[PDB]
Amino acid sequence: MNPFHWKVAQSASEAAALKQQSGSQILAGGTTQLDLMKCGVFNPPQLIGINGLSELRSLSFDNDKISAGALITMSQLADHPDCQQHAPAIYGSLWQAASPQIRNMATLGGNLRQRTRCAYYRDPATFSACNKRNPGSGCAARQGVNSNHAILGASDSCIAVYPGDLAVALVAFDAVVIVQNPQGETRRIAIDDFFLLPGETPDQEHDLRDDEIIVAIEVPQTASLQRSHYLKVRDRSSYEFAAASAAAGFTLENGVMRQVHIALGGVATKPWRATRVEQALEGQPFNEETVFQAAELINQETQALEHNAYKVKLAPRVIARALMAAGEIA
Amino acid sequence: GSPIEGLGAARSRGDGRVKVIGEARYAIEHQPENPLYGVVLQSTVASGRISRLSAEKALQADGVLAVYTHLNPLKINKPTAIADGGAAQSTYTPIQDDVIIHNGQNIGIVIAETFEQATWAASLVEIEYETTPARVFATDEGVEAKPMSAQDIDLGDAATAMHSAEVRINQRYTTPREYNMPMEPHACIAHWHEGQITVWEPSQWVAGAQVEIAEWLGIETEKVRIISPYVGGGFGSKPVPYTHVALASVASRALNRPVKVSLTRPQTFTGLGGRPATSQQLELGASRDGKIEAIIQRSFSETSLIDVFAENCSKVTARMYAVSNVSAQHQVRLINTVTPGWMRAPGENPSAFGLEVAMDELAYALDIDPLELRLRNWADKDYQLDLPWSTRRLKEAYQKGAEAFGWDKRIMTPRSMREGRELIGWGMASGTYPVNRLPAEAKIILTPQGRFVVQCAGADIGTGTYTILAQTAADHLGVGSETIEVELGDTALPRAGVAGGSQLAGNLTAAVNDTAKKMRERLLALASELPASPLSGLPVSQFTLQDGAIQHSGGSGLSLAQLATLAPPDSLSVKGGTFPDDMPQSERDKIVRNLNDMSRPEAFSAHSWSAQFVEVRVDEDFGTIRVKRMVAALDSGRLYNPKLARSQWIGGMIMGVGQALMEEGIVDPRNGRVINNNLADYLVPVNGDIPSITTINVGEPDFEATTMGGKAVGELGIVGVAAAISNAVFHATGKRVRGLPITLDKII
Amino acid sequence: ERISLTMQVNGQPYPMEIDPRVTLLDALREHLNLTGTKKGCDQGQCGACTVLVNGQRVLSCLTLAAQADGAEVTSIEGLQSASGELHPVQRCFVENDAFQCGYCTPGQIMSAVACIKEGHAGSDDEIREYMSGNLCRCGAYPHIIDAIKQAAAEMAK
């Protein structure tokens, strides 16, 4: 790694004040940050450990807001007694990610900010054309092996997929990201606006100033969140990112799907809310084939690249089967 | 069971306790004083020259002592290749010139005082290239094809027999690049002192390491000491050292200090070879009853521009069934890639995969049950060698495997068996591995405390050599084998050959069985010949060795520790082995120092056999595949340790599961880079991928195969598994996937 | 250029002054001379480095020794009691032959101890899933399930 200088922050505001300085980076769990430092894509001259900030560790489930601070680990959220019952899609987006060891390390704040698994992005010593890493240098994946790359939200500059499972469940259910600057004030960002499309600027992933730090997340507590599932398709059965995944939920009110929520993981540059599959199923009773045919509407915005065409076939099917699994609960 | 736990018992691993508490020390966990840390540099282009290399920013960083490249070189001699009688799988010599023959090639090493300093400074070396057009794939234009003619199979007349065959199956079967990926990365500690070098090298063959490192350094073989008591597995990837050890050795000699050099996990993909990609065009002629009268095969595999290594797809092709006319020819394709290396069952694995999928296609062309088809082709002898089998239980493997699996209830039509949203499929394949033999030696010592120590240079790579050599000696020493200590994996120990070709359990158990018999005779003689012994005058025929003591049938007795006190220390050390008693010592060195002196029985064809049955669950929407049930019946002959044998069996099967479902090398066609080189993008089976596995032992002791009665084990479990999984996926779906692996994109 | 920290490793204090880049994994191996924890990948993809930090299984290759300041680390060398009887997990691993080469075994064993404490030992499949974060290339998985099922039973008494 680069010979970084190690600094420990004693408050959220001092972490935001130190983060703002010229290439400094927060360290929470390390399972992304430290890995990409060894890959060579991260070389912060100053690394700021934020564990031992006790203010960010609060967690509670309510009748209205599920609320957790940024330093809550993946395991703590998933193991909370209400998580599986109140938010199955959130719970499923957790235990189906990484390994138990990683989930014990991984904070919710760092989980949202995890980076693409694009093989060319992660090997800068070999491939020097990455616009996300190295603005203006090109994209090595366009003419390379794009099997892992995006069929939705892609630009000419970056085709990288956002690998994370948790954000997919949050984006479906309209979570809010709360962030804080060095002077202590607070911004609340709807999560679908928190993740940015790469466009011509793949190096800007999130709506976060260098000024700012993620302090907390909150999710609306809804009967759509209560009846939900996270379905993850992958090559092997565990310890891998999704080839395709969908978080889905709805409330059944008067024998009818209402507040249908659907989001697509693993196929897009950012967690992708499928709004037209939702609208097509709203006011509709849960049934096998109408769910499957409505899911195929995602194929009107989808664009296959050379090696990722299988993701086009998977996308409507993981949407359908995640919905089918949701309608089996209550 | 039985208290001494002799050969044939199923006991716990004698090395188990030091492994479960973290005491056992692998290669780089040893502690020389003030060691330096090397980090290897690898090329980023497939073909060309190094036009510009500037290390000054690396030499200027913290703690960096040296950077060795072709611009700041150190002599490394081209080693003698394995095929020429040497210890070298790869003859590549790093930092001797600017030529780039493949991507990821070792072009240098950075030596620093701490590991963190060496890692950082290695990233600061700037390398520019002048690239030349690269041959990325074996099918590219301009790729030279070298036939392996000495391995051609010309048997009967295949052209005539195929022309008259009623039913012909003609298809191509491919396997991708695969990587052994043992959990212990390739790493070493090279310590050069005063004209000698000691190297801590994870090794399956320590005599081979000693030969190649001496050749690299240009010194006598006796001047190299290799210390490898524990290995984190090679599965074929650590029989012989690779060039990162060469760089570690010459650096240690130049700096006159110990150097710890670890390949990073990504660097182990191009720092040595895995299984090269293979392709085989396989034609089966048969009469309409299913009986096969002809087989024609044309296959090839990748190899580097430098070394000729063949992964030969004909290994099992004429062995398995009763076919009098077989034509097989294999060629290697020289491309820009690292020199290939062994992976579990080399040449046997891809040969069985193509053959045993082709049988399934022949079975569906004639609508014969696949098992029934293997019986109609049963070979009552070896048709390739025209020799009788020594022992072959394959029929009992078919029957006991089919019974346990429920194969009699199979509905032949693909997609017929379904549960919920999963398509069910059932598949089966034959498997085999050959019996090889090599001589070897061992020493047994009675300590002053009355304890036994067994010494052999053979390796325990996780196979259990530590355990079975203690069981062998216990049979003649009258003590429990758990009290016998075994020392292994060091060139200071008695001669031993490679652990490869699944031959070493039989070779070493034979060598220790002789040494232990000789130890028994020595102890009884001492009790009767030592005048201070309470047994001082008595006949040896009436002595027995029991429970740590020598006891006369007249009732008087002498303990083993008491005999140690009465005996000269040199008489308490006994040597034995399976070399001819008259063979000069120099030839005993040469035999174990190369790979070409292995023997097989004349007059008998001796092989292990297996029957593999698999149930897969294919998701109807997603095309994902899961292995629900595995039933295997294996003939390994006599099992030296049935519990360690099962661990080998299921170990090979799980590796075969990764081969079929997930493992693939991914090469970028533009640059020839392997871009999935890491354990995240190169998928090996995860605990959740593997169900409960049933293994059935159908074997009987075969003394025409090995002296001690066992046959091959270590590599048997993988053979044919990938074909049975493909046959099962077809039965679930209706799609033949002839290229591995079978991933969801290929299903839907 | 250097940092100072104290670490609780298997019940003993360890003050260190080190390059801040040193991972917990290499602090145990290269510094404290506790080599039981293994490095198979170093990027967090394997789990041979699994240790316990404050009772929880983590990957020491992705943990900086700086992050372990004032923390309780339990490596494989600390599972034995003060007299050094084998932990039930360690003994069931030998009896059921849950290892072959032994290199993934320390991480396998530490991950299984925490897996049991976490309550993930309830069934064979549950063990498979929540042990999947430890790769074994030797293929000892079926025996790892046996060893963990048996050890969870013994510990419940």
Ligand SMILES: Cc1cc2nc3c(=O)[nH]c(=O)nc-3n(C[C@H](O)[C@H](O)[C@H](O)COP(=O)(O)OP(=O)(O)OC[C@H]3O[C@@H](n4cnc5c(N)ncnc54)[C@H](O)[C@@H]3O)c2cc1C
């Ligand atoms: C082998 C492997 C497999 C994996 N598989 C999966 C998977 O299947 N599914 C999945 O969802 N994830 C997976 N992950 C990723 C894992 O979930 C994330 O790395 C983890 O959630 C990141 O959390 P962390 O606390 O380690 O963040 P860190 O690694 O500490 O930080 C990540 C990034 O976020 C920034 N950051 C951290 N905290 C804050 C804050 N409070 N404010 C602003 N920025 C911050 C850091 O500067 C850093 O750039 C995998 C990781 C590995 C290594």
Ligand SMILES: Nc1ccn([C@@H]2O[C@H](COP(=O)(O)OP(=O)(O)OC[C@H]3Oc4nc5nc(N)nc(O)c5nc4C(S)=C3S)[C@@H](O)[C@H]2O)c(=O)n1
């Ligand atoms: N008749 C027999 C023969 C063998 N055995 C058991 O099987 C083991 C292996 O015997 P053998 O078939 O002679 O295997 P080798 O020691 O000659 O070589 C091992 C073989 O199988 C392997 N097993 C491995 N296991 C581990 N854990 N790691 C590796 O890298 C391994 N690599 C390999 C590879 S590849 C090979 S070539 C013995 O220790 C013994 O426990 C037995 O019980 N009865």
Ligand code: SF4
């Ligand atoms: S895809 Fe995005 S990340 Fe991957 S290479 Fe192109 S730009 Fe860099």
Ligand code: MOS
């Ligand atoms: O013969 Mo085993 O080393 S591939």
Ligand code: FES
């Ligand atoms: S060494 Fe930490 S997970 Fe591989």
Ligand code: FES
């Ligand atoms: S014991 Fe060898 S990797 Fe698991």
